[PDB]
Amino acid sequence: MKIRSQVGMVLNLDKAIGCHTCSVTCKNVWTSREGVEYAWFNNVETKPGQGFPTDWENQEKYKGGWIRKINGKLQPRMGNRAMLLGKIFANPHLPGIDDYYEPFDFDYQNLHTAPEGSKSQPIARPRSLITGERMAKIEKGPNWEDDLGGEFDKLAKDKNFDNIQKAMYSQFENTFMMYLPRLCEHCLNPACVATCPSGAIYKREEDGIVLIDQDKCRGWRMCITGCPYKKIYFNWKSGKSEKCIFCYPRIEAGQPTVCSETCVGRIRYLGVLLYDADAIERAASTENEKDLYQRQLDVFLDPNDPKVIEQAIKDGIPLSVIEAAQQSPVYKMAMEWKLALPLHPEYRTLPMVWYVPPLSPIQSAADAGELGSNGILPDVESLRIPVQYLANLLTAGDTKPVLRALKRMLAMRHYKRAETVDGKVDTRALEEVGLTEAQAQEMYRYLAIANYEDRFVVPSSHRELAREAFPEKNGCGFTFGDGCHGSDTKFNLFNSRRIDAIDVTSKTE
Amino acid sequence: MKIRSQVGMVLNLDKAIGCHTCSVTCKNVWTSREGVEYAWFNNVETKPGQGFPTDWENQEKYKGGWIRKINGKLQPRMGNRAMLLGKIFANPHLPGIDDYYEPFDFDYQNLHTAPEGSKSQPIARPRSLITGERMAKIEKGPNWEDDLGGEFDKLAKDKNFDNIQKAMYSQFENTFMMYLPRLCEHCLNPACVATCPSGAIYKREEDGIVLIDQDKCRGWRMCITGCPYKKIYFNWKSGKSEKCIFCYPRIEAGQPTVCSETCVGRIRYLGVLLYDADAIERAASTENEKDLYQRQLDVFLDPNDPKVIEQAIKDGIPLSVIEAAQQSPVYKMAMEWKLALPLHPEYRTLPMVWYVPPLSPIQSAADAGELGSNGILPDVESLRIPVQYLANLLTAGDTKPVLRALKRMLAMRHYKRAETVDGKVDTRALEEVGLTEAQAQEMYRYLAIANYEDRFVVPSSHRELAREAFPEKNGCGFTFGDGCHGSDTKFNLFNSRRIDAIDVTSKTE
Amino acid sequence: MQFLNMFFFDIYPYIAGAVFLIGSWLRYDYGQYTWRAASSQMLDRKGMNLASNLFHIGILGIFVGHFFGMLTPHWMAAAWLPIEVKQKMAMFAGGASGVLCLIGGVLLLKRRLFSPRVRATTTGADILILSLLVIQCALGLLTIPFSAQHMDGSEMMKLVGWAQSVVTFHGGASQHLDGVAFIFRLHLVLGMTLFLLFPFSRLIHIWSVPVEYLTRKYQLVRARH
Amino acid sequence: MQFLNMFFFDIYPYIAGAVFLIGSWLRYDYGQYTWRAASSQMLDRKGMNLASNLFHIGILGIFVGHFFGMLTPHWMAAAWLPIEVKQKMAMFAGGASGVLCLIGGVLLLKRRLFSPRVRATTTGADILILSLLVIQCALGLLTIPFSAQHMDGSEMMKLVGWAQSVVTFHGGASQHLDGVAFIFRLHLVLGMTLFLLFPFSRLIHIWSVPVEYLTRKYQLVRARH
Amino acid sequence: SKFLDRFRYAKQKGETFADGHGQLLNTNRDWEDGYRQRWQHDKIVRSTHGVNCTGSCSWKIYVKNGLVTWETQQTDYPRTRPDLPNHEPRGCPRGASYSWYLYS
Amino acid sequence: SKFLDRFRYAKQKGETFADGHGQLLNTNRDWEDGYRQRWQHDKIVRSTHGVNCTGSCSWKIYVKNGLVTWETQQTDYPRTRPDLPNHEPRGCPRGASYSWYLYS
Ligand code: HEM
Ligand code: HEM
Ligand code: HEM
Ligand code: HEM
Ligand SMILES: CCCCCCCC(=O)O[C@H](COC(=O)CCCC)COP(=O)([O-])OC[C@@H](O)CO
Ligand SMILES: CCCCCCCC(=O)O[C@H](COC(=O)CCCC)COP(=O)([O-])OC[C@@H](O)CO
Ligand code: SF4
Ligand code: SF4
Ligand code: SF4
Ligand code: SF4
Ligand code: SF4
Ligand code: SF4
Ligand code: F3S
Ligand code: F3S
Ligand code: F3S
Ligand code: F3S
Incomplete structure (x- = not known):
């Protein structure tokens, strides 16, 4: 039993509007440099589709995540330590730039400088940001499949259509589409950390954010294959890999991530989750992959349980973090209401960015239909998005937890309609799904009204703990180049001293 | 004729409350590091007094500023190039740490950790920030003379009491005191730039801010002596010198300096001044030092003069800078109303931070006095602060320009009182000082009401001009350590490339 | 000629070695962000699996052979490992590794120069260092027919004598080379030159061979620091 | 002894020189903020005027003397500047400069070690480098009575021969030193060691002697860049 | 010195967790300033x-x-x-x- | 390379001004980022x-x-x-x- 904390995230796909605002803000702040222009730490994909990079969910092809060997031990799908090292001279599974898209720009200046007497109206043609050469045509982009862009037979190659008779969905009347925004899952059992030969990737103890040390990374580019979500992008210029940093500079002071605060649909929630680090391997190595979801819930600890609280304090968790954990919207959605589910738990990484499945228009039928258990509102069985597709995406193929989430959302709607339209109390739907009026009202508070203070409950990462914040406050930022940052040993060849430190020791004790 | 622009500053000493807020904010932002803890880029001094460092105005002692040789040529008081180099092994005029004060801290932790059974109440004693040793007593500080702290005979050593029979001022009834806040003057003919053997100090072309290049400075510590205002402070730890940077990071986007925006008394004004750089040497080398003030005014150009405007554009001054110059409060106070005067123009540096002299309570007299030219309000002749003292401080001993400034301020008061109390128009006082009703009303607008937009009229330094702002916007701040910043040649031993630049050249022209 | 002899084989080796070491240390302490393998695989995966593996497996074979060949003292298992037996090992095993290395190297150089995406994003140092490695490997293979003229290991004895004198700081190392074929002279000079340029090229990735990974726990967590 | 002879006088000089040069370049490009004279005068002005001037004027006299003494080819004005005349110049002018240097150096070291404000803010490298300079200057003065035993300049001829062989990269430089007094041996080794440590100490300020100032226009303005 | 820090190798090793599946390290994290200084603005x-x-x-x-x-x-x-x-x-x-x- | 930049010495010299009292230089000013990055905040x-x-x-x-x-x-x-x-x-x-x- 070793308690650690992390700010998890929940995205309500039912409220998702697939606008990509989250992607643009992240891009502007973190990846507008040459080398990562093609990398979208946060990217939104329209489903059905193969995504970015193409077919990233196909682990047989990309070799991401973990496998559970016959002896019960975990091993990266990429191979054990020796197998992985044997692939270092040329990663055989590495995604190529074309699996993402060839980054491009346009010759806008031609519009300004076109010479007098041009035979035709000047135009701005595409040019490659990789070679600087003219591109005859743009054939791919990071969001090429947006809103079912492409023939169904192409989009339907979607890994999540596995075990589903998808023919019926190629019919106009049965058309369906949803949005899947995603970033790094900042896993409890990250496959990236395990597949980096240099040990440059690590999970921060205090807030669970997973980072690639830009000093220590040696550019072995094996981690890219290791990540089953393909959320690590090689910086082709620096020769090192980069990934979503969960906006730690903001999180550290209690602010939401950029993609969370800028989410226009108001579908992202941030809240602390306390977990038992000592149970990570046991949970991730459970025999049946359909048990990974529940096994992970079992690693999450009850923040209102004095036993957990006292253990947390003993393990160094700050009081403000424990407090935040007690009013975590993420804990309520994943643990209490069972509305949020992990993304591909079968990869065995114990992801920390979860999703509430989306509702959808009722399916095509013979007639206009009849009043169901929910009156004029939909019954879970009538939704047009095949539940098996959602289960392949969130619960390793088990439709049970997906149906529960969807039914509970619809139940809340039924209950609230009786209240706001009929002015009556009708808990029939809630009782059918095991929800109390109090739970439905709280669900409504967080999901419908969704006040800012309720969507984001991020505590400080307390940078003052175990460090020296005073000298840092006084001297951080003066980047003159003292050459003494980044090492604990004081000796340095350039005979310098840290600008933000105190060299003259107190002699009065 | 070569026009350049600079954001000058004017401090209204008549509104000065000597609060030091300006000093604290600057300190917190720029000089809280070990090495410069004793340095106050902005410091406030109570006069009469010797200041910080002690007796800084005594150039015979400190050797700051310029001298005009018999042949009419200018030479740093420190010596010509050879003379200065001959002093490099040990600057004979260098101010010692004790001329400032020995920086100290206190053992606050003793209050927390004192052991049980202490014989007396624990206390926090002083300790040196230079040696870390216990200090028996604090004997000096940067503002030791605050509010006439010290015997008159000591304070009166004040250089500005030269040529004044000061005995009468040692009498209680004749007591007087004023405040002199100051920073670097960012001179047009800086003595610091001229006295640095490495050429590490320079005046920025676009905004006239004077800086010490932290890369290029070699720590010759000659500039410290060169500056007659002693506004350059040696960083005893880094071994390099630092000085007020006129908050260029803020000025660059059109914001006021920290000490300007945080000035509680609302006495600081920021406005553009256009100057003819080609006339700098001619002005600074005028034979009579009492002519330096007017000679400098002659270097300032009329921003509403189409001749100047067209020349400015030809010389590269941005349109927004010219526009700002046309509504500059600094230009109005120095050029139009003649209220602002330079600080020690006799140093021949052509300072760019000017001051409006302070009014004061009437002097001691035989009786309660009679109505003067200004009615119940003071006549310039009755002010208790000796005008000769103010002239020694601002006009090389010439009382004429000081009397004009003071009389005009009092005239505005007389005119406004007639208006607001008697409800009548009385321009008698204005006519006596050569002011029109319109000028008095504008003076009132800027000095009395002093709206934020009127106190600070700072244009952008236009960082996009002659540079590449696009790649910079996209990649500045990612301080991973590319080792390619600071040089124009691309070759670098570590075989790296700039993070905020584009390496892949366009091949489509 | 005697002047150049002492310069290249008595003086130059220490200049190259000093630069190699202090350059590596200085770049490690002040250039961590520049310390990377600089993979270009993603930009063009074509032919990399074959080319890079042939080149690296070959070059590593050469390294192991060169290391034990020139640094192992004669007295160690002298009876079982006489100089002429070591030479046969070098000629056949080293020769084979050299062929793999050269083929891989040439394929990689062809790629770096003519694959638009790689050529457009390369640094001059990458082209220079690989070109010198290809030339050095070829020079090495070319010494084989010369070594074949002295199967009694006489030539190798001279070369090993020189190498050992240099690494143990014994002056007069160049005397060991008296009479050796010129081809060996060239190989040694280019080889030492590679050490000289080493710290200012991508070769610094070699220092980072991930040995610790083989015994490292999978999950890494960093505490507040 | 012959092994150590070749190491210190044939090998070591090139290690020290390589480190001196590449270390200076690397620190200049990646350590501009650390490139300073590191004045400590403000913290304690007492005795600095006398100490620093004596030390610097003395050390510069030694530098000029050493520079022209060992690097000037014999044929240059050979008739007017025979070796024994150069030796007399070195003994008297160099000796005088050495005395000024040593006195200044000792005063500076006493200050750095016992003046609380200076001692409390010093770096270990400052104490080490000054201590070695004081020792080296003393060693130098101590060679004078030995040179006095050979006023015909025989000893100086050996030392100059060695120095010139080293700077022109002519192997066998150590042979020039045959029979020279041991004191000279020590002086040379510590001297070269100072070059080795040079780039990692405050001595980098020497590279920056402000020559350009003597002819520079007074006011400097930097354009948008 | 980052080079000298490598010698504190095993000394920077903290407690293992999850029955040897993980290792807690006590190593330098100053490099994190790289992304912090990008987010910072005027x-x-x-x-x-x-x-x-x-x-x-x-x-x-x-x-x-x-x-x-x-x-x-x-x-x-x-x-x-x-x-x-x-x-x-x-x-x-x-x-x-x-x-x-x-x-x- | 800052070292190589020194060779652009005279090449970075612009027009003189004030009859030779001053010199306009066209040299690197990247070091100015040092104080800019201190002012920047979260x-x-x-x-x-x-x-x-x-x-x-x-x-x-x-x-x-x-x-x-x-x-x-x-x-x-x-x-x-x-x-x-x-x-x-x-x-x-x-x-x-x-x-x-x-x-x-
Ligand atoms: C076991 C030790 C080594 C490892 C793990 C290693 C790993 C790598 C990796 C991952 C790459 C990037 C390949 C890509 O583009 O994806 C690379 C490139 C390279 N390596 Fe190594 N390497 C090792 C030893 C060496 C040695 C000993 C040499 C030669 C002295 C060498 C020379 C090169 C060269 C020249 C390249 C760039 C090829 C090109 O031009 O595309 N490597 N190495
Ligand atoms: C300072 C570095 C090097 C030194 C001192 C060196 C020395 C030698 C010597 C003495 C031989 C002849 C072996 C004998 O006497 O039987 C040899 C052969 C050879 N070397 Fe090198 N070498 C160096 C670097 C390299 C490099 C970097 C490469 C690959 C690019 C290389 C590739 C070869 C090959 C292919 C052969 C011939 C077969 C063998 O003996 O392995 N060498 N080298
Ligand atoms: C003309 C060239 C030189 C100039 C302009 C120069 C200038 C300076 C300056 C300004 C200081 C700081 C003094 C203070 O504390 O205020 C200093 C210190 C020092 N210099 Fe030089 N220097 C020169 C040459 C040398 C040489 C050739 C050496 C010896 C190889 C040397 C050795 C030292 C030492 C050891 C110190 C520090 C003394 C202490 O421990 O306080 N300098 N130099
Ligand atoms: C690598 C550096 C140095 C070399 C090769 C060197 C070499 C020599 C030699 C050969 C002599 C005897 C002159 C003769 O033959 O008449 C000498 C003398 C001397 N050296 Fe040095 N020296 C070095 C550095 C220094 C330094 C750094 C100092 C001061 C701290 C110094 C101070 C002296 C003094 C005082 C003498 C005696 C008088 C004279 O000949 O100037 N030397 N040195
Ligand atoms: C004598 C000066 C040597 C400077 C070497 C610079 C490189 C460096 O330390 O690379 C290291 C190997 O070198 C040594 O430890 C050698 C011992 C000295 C002879 C590797 O550093 P690293 O940060 O790449 O480690 C990554 C680990 O994951 C490797 O298992
Ligand atoms: C061979 C590699 C040499 C690296 C030297 C590093 C120092 C450096 O350049 O210092 C410089 C002098 O050295 C040369 O130019 C020497 C030519 C090479 C033999 C001085 O650099 P600096 O920035 O101190 O200049 C300041 C000027 O104001 C001096 O007038
Ligand atoms: S105002 Fe709002 S809706 Fe309109 S472009 Fe801007 S962000 Fe979009
Ligand atoms: S989602 Fe993030 S933490 Fe999880 S394996 Fe991928 S990169 Fe690592
Ligand atoms: S958490 Fe921050 S870094 Fe990660 S995807 Fe969102 S905005 Fe980008
Ligand atoms: S509230 Fe205002 S007056 Fe009071 S302490 Fe703060 S700044 Fe000063
Ligand atoms: S006031 Fe400022 S610009 Fe003027 S000489 Fe002093 S430091 Fe230089
Ligand atoms: S302008 Fe800025 S740096 Fe200068 S004194 Fe004011 S606050 Fe300090
Ligand atoms: S494998 Fe590791 S070395 Fe860098 S490229 Fe990935 S974090
Ligand atoms: S797609 Fe739009 S709804 Fe939110 S998750 Fe992204 S900003
Ligand atoms: S003299 Fe120049 S070298 Fe630095 S300490 Fe002053 S700016
Ligand atoms: S003393 Fe106070 S009045 Fe303004 S100039 Fe400073 S804040």
């Missing part, structure tokens, strides 16, 4: 978009290095009744990209 | 001081590197009548030093 200015979208969204315009670098939505609109959701953050993908134009 | 938060001074001044609390580093006065108080001066910036030396306490 100031934020309130502005909006003069485009015909009907959005009328207020944004925080970030100025860094004296240049406009990016924008994120303001969230301080006067809140609506307790029974209604509030307007924040508003915004859209088009608006989030406006900063691109300034020096494009 | 965010500003509005707060005031719970001390018995009567000031009641609103301040901008600067957070940088996830820590409180300094403060400067807010200047956005509702403006007073046109015939009266406004309240901004208010503040005092005591208040300007409060940030010192947090990690002191």
